Amino acid sequence: DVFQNETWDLFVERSKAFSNCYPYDVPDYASLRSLVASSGTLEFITEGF
Amino acid sequence: STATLCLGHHAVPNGTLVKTITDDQIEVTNATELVQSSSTGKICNNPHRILDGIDCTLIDALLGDPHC
Amino acid sequence: NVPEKQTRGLFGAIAGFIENGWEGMIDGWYGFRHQNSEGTGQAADLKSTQAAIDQINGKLNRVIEKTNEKFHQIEKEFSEVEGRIQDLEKYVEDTKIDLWSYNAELLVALENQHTIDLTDSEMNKLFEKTRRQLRENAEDMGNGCFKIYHKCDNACIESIRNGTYDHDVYRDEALNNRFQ
Amino acid sequence: QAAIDQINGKLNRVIEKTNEKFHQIEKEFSEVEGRIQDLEKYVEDTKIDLWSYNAELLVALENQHTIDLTDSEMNKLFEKTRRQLRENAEDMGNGCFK
Ligand SMILES: *[C@@H]1O[C@H](CO)[C@@H](O)[C@H](O)[C@H]1NC(C)=O
Ligand SMILES: *[C@@H]1O[C@H](CO)[C@@H](O)[C@H](O)[C@H]1NC(C)=O
Ligand SMILES: *[C@@H]1O[C@H](CO)[C@@H](O)[C@H](O)[C@H]1NC(C)=O
Ligand SMILES: *[C@@H]1O[C@H](CO)[C@@H](O)[C@H](O)[C@H]1NC(C)=O
Hints:
The structure is cut from a larger assembly and holds four copies of chain A.
Chain A (H helix, E strand, L loop, with lengths): L28 H11 L10
The complex binds 2-acetamido-2-deoxy-beta-D-glucopyranose (4 copies).
One 2-acetamido-2-deoxy-beta-D-glucopyranose (NAG) binds next to helix 3 of chain C.
Subcellular location (chain C): Host apical cell membrane; Virion membrane
GO molecular function (chain C): host cell surface receptor binding
Protein name (chain C): Hemagglutinin
């Protein structure tokens, strides 16, 4: 959660990185990762669903 | 008493600059552009058979869209 | 290109050399300018001019001929965001473009370098051939000129230019004027 | 000065205009995936091989022409000196005029 609304020109992933929430799998994980990285921001706007 | 014979080559009032392995900018009498950087602005219809999809994508024509 | 408008070193009395080009000829790339008792004249060398032009046009034809023909290809512009496959296509096209741009740059640089080198080599070859024709009758000036120590009339100059020149029939007087 | 200028010019040509690249395909994989991963590997390997060959050829050509132009400068200087010594001198054959 420390990465909320963060922005980057280069996101550096560490080999020690781990997941500590509900187990999840992303079909086409690479595509989502690549497009999010190319976007360069995690700027999240909440919407009134 | 004597004669003089000098050998030389043609030159032009102002040539064109070109790049080389040694000199980054050297003048030559004549040069030609090897990059086509301009377009006619129109698609010639020959010799290739051009088909204009005015208001139709290829898939719409494939499926048989009424306006296609 | 080495222009020579303002006589570049001397007055009209003594002019013409290899260190500087000549704008006063249009009939050939290489040529001669001569002064003698008969007056002054200029001419062009068709052999070296034709050889150089042939080589230049040959390399141009090599460069331009055999255009590649391509009909169906990957999509190179995208209106969507898709990720792995689209990024791969973009990378492939960018790699091709960069490699071909580098190839064009290197090819043009090499061709220009060798064009200049071969033209200078043709000029030096012509000068060397003229110098070896003037076996001993003449003496090299260092500015691209030979001083002929005899009465080398317009017929003499024509023989030198066209290759029928005979050194011996002037050798005695040329040497006598050189050393005495 | 002429030779040094040419050498530095070719060096600047070689080094200047560095390509800038920001986002690219993945080139290291922790999984086995088959067709797409093999295609990515092949693309990157082809690029690497082509650029390695280009670097090899470029360096060879540049070194060859550097040596050739330096020798040409030396010969040009010798020729110019020889033509200055129109007849006062006589060439020794070892690079010297008497
Ligand atoms: C992130 O930025 C958006 C505006 O772009 C804002 O609405 C939102 O509250 C921000 N979130 C945090 C955690 O600061
Ligand atoms: C040719 O024209 C260009 C125009 O910028 C120039 O600066 C250069 O000095 C010119 N050379 C001659 C010999 O006129
Ligand atoms: C320059 O070269 C081109 C290509 O060979 C030729 O068509 C053109 O006539 C040349 N121009 C001059 C002034 O020599
Ligand atoms: C070369 O020039 C000399 C001198 O005018 C002339 O006698 C001779 O016929 C010429 N040869 C040719 C092949 O034109």
